[PDB]
């Protein structure tokens, strides 16, 4: 559709008739995408639109089934979405959450970390772990725990599965806090395997070359790498003198024995240097190759989604001494300043971006 | 001692890109740095150049492009504004050095720029 | 101290212009030189500025406008590439002098730039 | 005691560790308090029970103490009135700034940015403690200044916020407060600084304001920060206001040559003093006092004569807890080194 | 690419030193260069830094320390005037190189400075 | 052409000051700028100077004072660290211009510096 | 706005001179400055010139004459080494100013140079 | 690091010549560069030198020779005008660099210059 020697951008044909403010995303592991506004949610497998009327939603694993909806302080769970062509349709579980809806607080980020459960974060920084299976395969909606004791959570990611019902989950905050939690659906307690603050380290790595990093450095996102102990971070600094924004990818290696880390590598994007004025948008890291369990490729393609652009770069998969021996390329897909990105998704080969009026764009890195 | 370019990709007509090539290695400060391009079918032509004599632009990109170089560094930037479908092609960076009268060229691998 | 500008007029969308301003004055080198603009209805916004402490561009002109100054000379230039209709307005030049802590600003009288 | 050709510094008590106090030369008394008691003495009674303010007598009399959301007034400090304030004490909010603007009353500001006008006299000259009005509808008030007394019981008050809002209010004990001036000067100062100092964008902050000899002109103290070079610049902006059109013009802009360090102590607030109110302006910083001179009349001979800017440097030990002033000097209250007095010989 | 530091030792309170670090390698001019110190018991802090984007000093050494560097060679001098006992510590030099967005750090191995 | 000086005042022994003289006029960049002082009783001596031919310090202030000049501007700074009662006196600033061989001096009116 | 020239006189074959001219008046930095000469009988020719673009020398004086300029000052120098009798003539200084497109010339009255 | 000088050969009395030498290698900008000569029978003498402090000429060649260095480049030129038979000899180029206090000399192998 639109291709060069490195990647392909295809428009696809999906089209949702709503409206005038949309949210949504697309989960390729479950195999379904959903898009919702203030009145209804539309679900559809990525292989017409099944509707649930009534707000932030998430699909669960079951063949088809599973929808969680958070509205205010109320969470409602339908274990089988496949058992609905009804209008109401009330075979749901409910849970009142300790969310202060009157104080302007709303749910912001949420992750599906099955078989453990669901992790939610709020605009005020609180973090909830919620269980959907209750120690007997039964479907429930119980509060697991709180993981919080002008800062906010900016990323929630899945770690490896440590056993039956147990999984690691990574949490990153805008002020530089990084945590690796072990959560489980089973009768057990949450436990922090990693709890560090990487803010000062990235700051020290940038301060000599970019003094204006002090007072402007902010973390936007993080993403795990092929090694369980390594994480990628997306930060930004701002030079108010020249009115310039710099974006930084930092590869950090963690050590669960000593609860410590070391900055492995630091890269400043050459192709995108614009500030994020729309405070509702959060730039995101995508490593599609991370989805294939048997990934045997020397190069790792990372994509960064910005409100009107997708930056594509390559690094070495193995964080060794040959890492910087070969200089890599950095390309960009410049979208029209019109497109309103409302969500994203990804599989092992490509990235999917949901616009409000241009459909679902697919970025496929040929490698 | 390689030359590697960045900033290529896909844009729709009327958009903008910023190519950059910062390649360096053992070599000292280059005397001249330039951007060439090869359109599909056409022949490789100089787009812009910069040296101690001043910045040169080919007329087709004049008024739209800006070549710049961080002083003394072996890094060159080509800002391409208001792009046309005719700007599509493979863009190469070129560095030239003169020492003792000996003149050496250095070429990058190139980067694709596609305008819609 | 007087600022006098040159080089305005009417230009098609995608065209380019070059504005210049020269300060003939009893004083020495101005500490900072800048270009502001006022669109019809909108309020006057700085467009570009240059001083020892930094060179600033507004986002809406970033990459398309280039402000340069002749070292210590009291002449500043604004190269406007890839002009768009939203660039239409009255462009003013501003010079800022700082002596012993006392800060003074001087303005030109304005130049019309219309983009179709 | 310590003098040169331009000014004099005279040195002129018990400990406890947070301290709060000031010195009012118009009333003629100084005040200092901790968490347990307050000591008052004309320029040494003790009152136990927190932010206090001396009121005018009706020779000696009067003290107001605010603790949490409760205010208590003694018409004579040698039988009190009480008032519950709409201050959210559980939400970590405290009273921060307070001004005696008699005969109108008392004006308070909070850490959260709310402003209270409170009356102490109630239509008969009778001592009261009733709420007059709210004047508020990461910003905070940084200065509260008295203006002229415009009649029986009425007085002007100038309010300056951190972000640049400046307001002239006409308050009275007898009414309905009416804003005579309400402007935002932040963008104007920023425009005056952005070309020469581009790093002003994102760092410019207003610290204090002070009236000038003209009712329509004010002096503003601001700071900008250069993160590249870790430098802090301080800016005196002379601004002339027009009450008819609620407008203003930056008359002049001066950057201090002699003091350029940041204020890491987030509890300190630098202060302008113009004790004649040539014009000698003093600026009190945590460990220094900058003395500069300007021209009184804001005319065309304003910048015709270049003026000196000197500084009195104190030890980095001195903990300034408050200040005051009369018509010839400025008084600075340290915790352990007494009450320093700066007298500008002019 | 190593960094060799010189100028340490013992000095009386109120004295002065001049630290220097000049070592280089194959690659050209470093983009930034800085002095850090680790006092006995305290944590390692940046003391001064110099780069295209500014010259930073720590408030505790401001006015007494001067970081300088010639553009031609990768040498940094730290003039330390009016020394205090609080200045005693191990001083390290740090170079930072930036090539095409790749940012690399390099550290000297330290130099002891004792003040009486 | 006038010269006015700032930074003087009152300090205790071991403290710091930073004198600045930044005054200018219709003349160009001064060829040399210097700080002199007259202590109570003694004669006027040169404390520091800076010119294209070098930066001179008197031996009494070496390692404690630092003279600096803001590039081409007619603005000079004298950072005085680790002050002693011997540094008390009236400090003057001196500018020196050379045009076509004609050498002209310019003096400030002086600023008092007292140390305790 | 006047130009005065010095350095002339009489020299033997193989000697050297250094002509100089400094412009005085209410005017900024000249855009270009040049030296011309008129030999007995011949017509006026351009000997040397310096501007933004560099230095021009006539072939007959190339290698022996060096034109120099104090970048900001309105002072131009002409070092004349290894003089020949054919260099005898009246040497004029010329200054060229360009402001807002207006181009103005200024001449000195001339200085006699004789070579034996 | 090698030094090869060009420009030597034959010339007649009263003729002119330009020696040139460009350092090739990894080293940074040399701290000083000079031309020396060894006449037949006499000892090797420094004829010209250049460094940050300035340019030095020997009186034997002052007013007849001119040493110059390309701005921030390890390249020297020696323009020799008004030659004499006493100027015949082997001219060597010399580059001296000071790194961390260590002083290093580098000599070219020399070029013959003959004057008739």
Author numbering:
A (entry chain A): 61 to 79, 84 to 111, 118 to 124, 136 to 143, 160 to 185, 190 to 250, 264 to 481
B (entry chain D), C (entry chain J), E (entry chain B), F (entry chain L), G (entry chain H), H (entry chain F): 2 to 117
D (entry chain I): 61 to 72, 76 to 79, 84 to 110, 119 to 124, 136 to 144, 160 to 179, 192 to 250, 264 to 300, ...
Paper text:
Additionally, we solved the structure of Nup133NTD bound by a second nanobody, VHH-SAN5, to 2.8 Å resolution. The N-terminal β-strand of VHH-SAN5 also makes extended contact with strand D of blade β6 on an adjacent copy of Nup133NTD, ultimately forming a hexameric packing assembly in the core of the asymmetric unit. Two such Nup133NTD-VHH-SAN5 heterohexamers stack, creating the striking dodecameric asymmetric unit.
Here we report the structures of the Nup84-Nup133 C-terminal α-helical domain and Nup133 N-terminal β-propeller from S. cerevisiae.
